[PDB]
């Protein structure tokens, strides 16, 4: 209630320090948790050496950056990421192999995976900009054919979601646990599973309030998405030459 800015700026930085990667937020995160915390399931269907690599897999790594402008209508999708595929496809979109990033080197060598997720969607918007976005997670997007009529902010507001206001420039934390029909997702081509490899559903960022401003205001803003794999477990140690690149999309 009594402001006194100095050379530092009178703020309070919140830190997310996860395995030598530190994320900083000026604002408070707007969290939303779709499902409760999952259990480890190496008991029921694995006899191979099952081990996470928490020093290299529970790190933060950007998977998407995009430009939200004022030339977007009311109900318009900005991002639609199939996150376990989107990590590998964001690496392959930077034109290299998957063995050059320490986050994804167990995906090259193992066969199956189960772990929870942490998604940070950070906007960099001016204080005078006005707008609002959704951060809605949907489990198993491709297994529903009527999802093309579902992708709208009217339907995504009904399930739980994270709101991002362009004025406050706040942040969206997304605790995504593993919830799938099968208790493991294969990383490569595996028997009677040829398509939809390592797909758990779509994080899709759409617009509620389009970006509004004055006549000479800053036209665009930037949105960056980071991901974390914290409660992982990798099973089925295999050859890396069996692995193939992801579908481009």
């Amino acid at each position: 209630d009594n402001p006194n800015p100095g050379p530092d700026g009178e703020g309070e930085v919140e830190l997310e320090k996860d395995s030598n990667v530190v994320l900083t937020t000026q604002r408070d995160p707007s969290t939303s948790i779709p499902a409760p915390v999952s259990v480890k399931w190496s008991r029921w269907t694995s006899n191979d050496v099952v081990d996470d690599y928490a020093t290299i897999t529970s790190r933060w790594y950007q998977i998407a950056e995009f430009v939200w402008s004022k030339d977007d209508p009311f109900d318009k999708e900005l991002a639609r990421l199939i996150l376990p595929r989107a990590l590998l496809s964001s690496i392959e979109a930077n034109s290299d192999a998957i063995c050059d990033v320490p986050n994804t080197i167990p995906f090259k060598v193992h066969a199956y995976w189960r772990g929870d997720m942490e998604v940070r969607v950070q906007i960099n918007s001016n204080k005078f900009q006005v707008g609002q976005l959704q951060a809605t997670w949907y489990y198993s997007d491709h297994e529903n054919l009527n999802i093309s009529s579902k992708r709208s902010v009217y339907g995504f507001s009904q399930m739980d979601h994270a709101l991002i206001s362009a004025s406050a420039s706040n942040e969206a934390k997304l605790v995504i646990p593993f919830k799938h029909v099968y208790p493991f997702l294969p990383t490569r081509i595996v028997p009677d599973w040829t398509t939809g490899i390592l797909d758990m559903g779509a994080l899709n960022i759409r617009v509620i309030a389009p970006l509004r401003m004055s006549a000479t205001g800053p036209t665009t803003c930037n949105v960056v998405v980071f991901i974390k794999l914290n409660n992982s477990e990798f099973t089925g140690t295999s050859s890396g030459k069996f692995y193939a690149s992801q579908i481009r999309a």
Binding site: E143, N144, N146, W193, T195, D199
Partner: peptide
Amino acid sequence: QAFNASSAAS
């Protein structure tokens, strides 16, 4: 939901 067949195991 209205099922869309992607794989054989699904």
